Amino acid sequence: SLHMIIEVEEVVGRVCKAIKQISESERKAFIVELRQLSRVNHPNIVKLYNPVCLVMEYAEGGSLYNVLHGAEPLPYYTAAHAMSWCLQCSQGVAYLHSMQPKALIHRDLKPPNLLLVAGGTVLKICDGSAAWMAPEVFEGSNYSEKCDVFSWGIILWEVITRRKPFDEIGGPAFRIMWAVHNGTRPPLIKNLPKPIESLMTRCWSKDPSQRPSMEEIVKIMTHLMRYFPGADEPLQYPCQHSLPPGEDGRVEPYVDFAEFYRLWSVDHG
Numbered sequence: 001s002l003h004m005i006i007e008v009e010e011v012v013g014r015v016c017k018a019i020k021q022i023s024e025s026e027r028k029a030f031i032v033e034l035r036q037l038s039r040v041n042h043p044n045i046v047k048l049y050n051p052v053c054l055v056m057e058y059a060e061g062g063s064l065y066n067v068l069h070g071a072e073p074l075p076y077y078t079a080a081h082a083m084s085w086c087l088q089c090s091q092g093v094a095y096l097h098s099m100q101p102k103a104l105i106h107r108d109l110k111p112p113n114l115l116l117v118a119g120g121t122v123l124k125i126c127d128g129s130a131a132w133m134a135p136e137v138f139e140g141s142n143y144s145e146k147c148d149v150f151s152w153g154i155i156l157w158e159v160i161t162r163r164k165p166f167d168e169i170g171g172p173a174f175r176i177m178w179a180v181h182n183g184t185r186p187p188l189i190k191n192l193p194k195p196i197e198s199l200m201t202r203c204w205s206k207d208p209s210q211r212p213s214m215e216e217i218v219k220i221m222t223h224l225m226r227y228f229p230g231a232d233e234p235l236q237y238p239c240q241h242s243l244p245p246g247e248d249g250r251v252e253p254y255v256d257f258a259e260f261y262r263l264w265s266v267d268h269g
């Protein structure tokens with residue numbers, strides 16, 4: 001089904017303030033996108049409400065990328081938020097993978113396409129990118145849903161460290177592609193829990209078959225939230241920001257896992 005429908009407000013980006021727009025050349029790319037959006041319905045995916053145009057829900061928080069790296073002042077967030085964000089992301093992507101008749105692939109998963117609402121607590125998927133792109137994709141191979149798992153792995157490293165992936169490399173896109181294709185991955189995280197480290201490295205394996213499914217990622221992340229309480233708390237506290245460059249191929253995390261090891265000790269010991 002598809003609902004039919006406003007006061008046009010100030011422009012937000014390149015799309016005004018929930019709307020989007022056609023540029024009549026994109027009228028064909030528009031039809032391919034709308035047909036699939038009407039079939040999709042999920043909490044962690046953006047809600048769609050003459051001339052040709054859409055009406056999405058206006059996420060006041062903006063993109064996850066803007067929250068993590070955008071204009072100051074940036075908000076404070078915890079390990080709970082970071083894990084919750086990645087959990088809700090894998091929930092929405094799993095919905096797309098588990099779709100009949102054909103499994104819908106997102107292809108371009110990255111924080112700039114992940115919106116936040118309800119005080120930065122609820123994450124929603126919204127259908128340059130070399131940092132999050134799986135190696136088999138930009139080489140020109142028969143890629144599959146497992147390329148979204150690679151992207152998720154990079155996003156997991158990104159919210160924990162609050163670092164732009166492959167910012168040390170920089171340059172044009174082909175320089176990042178060359179690195180990822182040769183095997184370079186983001187540096188490991190200091191004092192990162194072994195369960196999280198294991199899921200992250202698996203998610204960005206060279207061989208796509210060795211990466212876990214999104215259903216497996218959701219289930220694992222759901223059981224880990226037991227040890228990450230406080231994801232419902234809205235973001236409201238400021239954050240004065242200084243980043244130390246990570247020498248010797250190892251970086252410090254932004255979030256703090258102290259509470260995780262504490263709660264983990266109670267159950268296991």
Ligand SMILES: */C=C/C(=O)Nc1ccccc1Oc1nc(Nc2cnn(C)c2)ncc1Cl
Binds near residue numbers: 013014060114125127
């Ligand atoms: C879903 C992809 C996406 O984020 N597209 C996009 C990019 C830039 C600006 C707006 C926009 O679309 C949306 N933005 C927002 N909120 C918002 C507030 N300020 N900015 C920059 C974005 N909410 C929903 C959408 Cl579809």
